[PDB]
C-alpha cells in the first residue's frame, strides 16, 4: 500500500568551533531506521531498526560520507544566514531540513518533500511540482534567486523521483505492519459520590488515534480530560482520555478507540464486581 | 538513503 521515507536534519551553528552540531534522523513509515549524530564519540550513520543491520559495510561508509558533506553544507549555509540577517547575535542559530518521499501502491512518487526552517520558522520550501520554491521572507528570496540561477530544484527532484523511491523499496523488502491499540479502563476516586474513569490506549503504532467517551451511543456534555499522544519508548505510543461519573453508574459509560490498525473501532467499559 | 544537498548553499 502507501509508504513513506523522511530525513529530519538539524544543524546548530558553533562558528567558534570546527563544525556545527548536526544530527540526521531517517524514518520509514514514520518509524526511525537510521541516525547520524555529531555528539557521538565516532560520528557515523548507524541502524536504528534491526532490519537495517543487513545492509553491508559500503552502505554505512557511503551514508557517513554524505553526512560529513551535509555538515559542511550546513556550516557554510549558517554563515550565509548570519550575513543575510545582518549578524544579529545568538547562541542557537538553527537550520532544519526535512526531505523525503511518499510511495503509492502502484510504486509511483505520490509526493516529494524538501523544506527548510531557520530560527524555528519556515525559510524556503520546494513546491509540490518539484520545480519552484516558496520563500518566507527577504533573506529566503536571496536563496531562491541563487537556487533558480543554479538549477538547484533539478538536483532535488532527481533525488526524490529516483534514489528516494528506489531505496524506500529496498527498505520495505528488508523490513518485510501496524500495531493495534490494546485498551483498558482504570477507576479512580475524585469527589464525594463521583469517580474518574480513565480510558487508556497502549502499544499502538502509528501515533494517530482518537479516544471518545459515550453513554448509550450518545456523546457526553462534559469535556474529556486527555493527554497528548506520547511515545512509550519501544516504538509504540500511549494516550488516555478521562471522564468524571457518578459512583455506581460507571458500567453505563463506554470508551471508543479509533485507530487505522483496527478492522473496527474498540468499545470497552469499566466492569463493576 | 539520505539526500546530499545540491552544492549551492543557502
Amino acid at each position, epitope marked *: 500500500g502507501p509508504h513513506s521515507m523522511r530525513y529530519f536534519e538539524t544543524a546548530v551553528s558553533r562558528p567558534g568551533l570546527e563544525e556545527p552540531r548536526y544530527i540526521s534522523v531517517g524514518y520509514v513509515d514514520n518509524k526511525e531506521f537510521v541516525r547520524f549524530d555529531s555528539d557521538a564519540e565516532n560520528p557515523r550513520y548507524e541502524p536504528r531498526a534491526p532490519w537495517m543491520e543487513q545492509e553491508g559495510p559500503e552502505y554505512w561508509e557511503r551514508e557517513t560520507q554524505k553526512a560529513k558533506g551535509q555538515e559542511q553544507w550546513f556550516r*557554510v549555509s549558517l554563515r550565509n544566514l548570519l550575513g543575510y540577517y545582518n549578524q544579529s547575535a545568538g547562541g542557537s542559530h538553527t537550520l532544519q531540513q526535512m526531505s523525503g518521499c511518499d510511495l503509492g501502491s502502484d510504486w509511483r512518487l505520490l509526493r516529494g518533500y524538501l523544506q527548510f526552517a531557520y530560527e524555528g520558522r519556515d525559510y524556503i520550501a520546494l513546491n509540490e511540482d518539484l520545480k519552484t520554491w516558496t520563500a518566507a521572507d527577504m533573506a529566503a528570496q536571496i536563496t531562491r534567486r541563487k537556487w533558480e540561477q543554479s*538549477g538547484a530544484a533539478e*538536483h532535488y527532484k532527481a533525488y526524490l523521483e529516483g534514489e528516494c523511491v528506489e531505496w524506500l523499496h529496498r527498505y520495505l523488502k528488508n523490513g518485510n505492519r501496524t500495531d493495534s491499540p490494546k485498551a483498558h479502563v482504570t477507576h479512580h476516586p475524585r469527589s464525594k459520590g463521583e469517580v474518574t474513569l480513565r480510558c487508556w490506549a497502549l502499544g499502538f503504532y502509528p501515533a494517530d488515534i482518537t479516544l471518545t467517551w459515550q453513554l448509550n451511543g450518545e456523546e457526553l456534555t462534559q469535556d474529556m480530560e486527555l493527554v497528548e499522544t506520547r511515545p512509550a519508548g519501544d516504538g509504540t505510543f500511549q494516550k488516555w482520555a478521562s471522564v468524571v461519573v457518578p459512583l455506581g453508574k460507571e458500567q453505563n459509560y463506554t470508551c471508543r478507540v479509533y485507530h487505522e490498525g483496527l478492522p473496527e473501532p474498540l468499545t470497552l467499559r469499566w466492569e463493576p464486581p | 538513503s539520505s539526500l546530499e544537498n545540491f552544492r*549551492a548553499y543557502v
Partner: T-cell receptor
Framework: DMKVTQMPRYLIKRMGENVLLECGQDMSHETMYWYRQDPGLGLQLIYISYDVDSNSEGDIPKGYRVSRKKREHFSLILDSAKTNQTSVYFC?????????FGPGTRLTVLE | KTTQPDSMESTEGETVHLPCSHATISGNEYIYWYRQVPLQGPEYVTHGLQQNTTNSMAFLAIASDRKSSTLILPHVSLRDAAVYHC???????????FGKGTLLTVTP
C-alpha cells in the same frame, strides 16, 4: 559581471625565492580554486577553498599553501620556488553552478 | 570518468558533434562541458543532468540510459576551436577532474 582576476599574466622568479599569486572575485562566491597546467597535460587541482579558512588539499598540493581570509580573494604561496613549479596557474570560483576561471599566471622559475 | 575521442576536425559553418561516454555515471552526477583555447582560461559551455539542454553556445544531448552524451555545435565558428572537456560533476561536489578532452580544429 562573472569575472575572476589574476595579475600578473607572467612572472619570473629565481629558484628558492618565495612567490605569492593572487586571485580576486568581487561576486563573493564561497568557493575558490587553484589549479596548475603544464603543457600537454591537463588542469590539476592544487587546493580548493570552501570558505574563509576552510581549505582542502587537491590532487597536487605539495610545494604550495594557500590563504583565504576574505571570500573575495584566494592566494597561492610557494615558500621556496622549484624549477619544476614552472607552469601556468589558474584560479577559479563558483557559486554552485559552473566554475569561472581567471586568465592565468605563467610562472617561470629559473636557477 | 568520461571518455572522448582525442581529436575532431571540421570546416567553419558545419555542425560539430562531440561524443562523450560515461557508462559508470551515478544518478546525482551532472555532465558538464568546458572548453579551453591553448594557454587561456577554461570556459563553461553547458551542462545537463538528463535528456536535452539548449543555450546560446551549444546543444547537449544525453541518452535515455545517461551512459553517453553529445555536445553539438551548429554552424561552428573559428572562435569555437578549443579542447572540449566532458566532465562528470557530482550535484553535491565542487571538485572536477579534467581529463584529456577532444581537441576540436576548425578550418576556414
Amino acid at each position: 559581471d562573472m569575472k575572476v582576476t589574476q595579475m600578473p599574466r607572467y612572472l619570473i622568479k629565481r629558484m628558492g625565492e618565495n612567490v605569492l599569486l593572487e586571485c580576486g572575485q568581487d561576486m563573493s562566491h564561497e568557493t575558490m580554486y587553484w589549479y596548475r597546467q603544464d603543457p600537454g597535460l591537463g588542469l590539476q587541482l592544487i587546493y580548493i577553498s570552501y570558505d574563509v579558512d576552510s581549505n582542502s588539499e587537491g590532487d597536487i598540493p605539495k610545494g604550495y599553501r594557500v590563504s583565504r581570509k576574505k571570500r573575495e580573494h584566494f592566494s597561492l604561496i610557494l615558500d621556496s620556488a622549484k624549477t619544476n613549479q614552472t607552469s601556468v596557474y589558474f584560479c577559479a570560483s563558483s557559486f554552485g553552478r559552473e566554475q569561472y576561471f581567471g586568465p592565468g599566471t605563467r610562472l617561470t622559475v629559473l636557477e | 570518468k568520461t571518455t572522448q575521442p582525442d581529436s575532431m576536425e571540421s570546416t567553419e559553418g558545419e555542425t560539430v558533434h562531440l561524443p562523450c561516454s560515461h557508462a559508470t555515471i551515478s544518478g546525482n552526477e551532472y555532465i558538464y562541458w568546458y572548453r579551453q583555447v591553448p594557454l587561456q582560461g577554461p570556459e563553461y559551455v553547458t551542462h545537463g543532468l538528463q535528456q536535452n539542454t539548449t543555450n546560446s553556445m551549444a546543444f547537449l544531448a544525453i541518452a535515455s540510459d545517461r551512459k553517453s552524451s553529445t555536445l553539438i555545435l551548429p554552424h561552428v565558428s573559428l572562435r569555437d576551436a578549443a579542447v572540449y572537456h566532458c566532465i562528470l560533476s557530482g550535484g553535491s561536489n565542487y571538485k572536477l577532474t579534467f581529463g584529456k578532452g577532444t581537441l576540436l580544429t576548425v578550418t576556414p
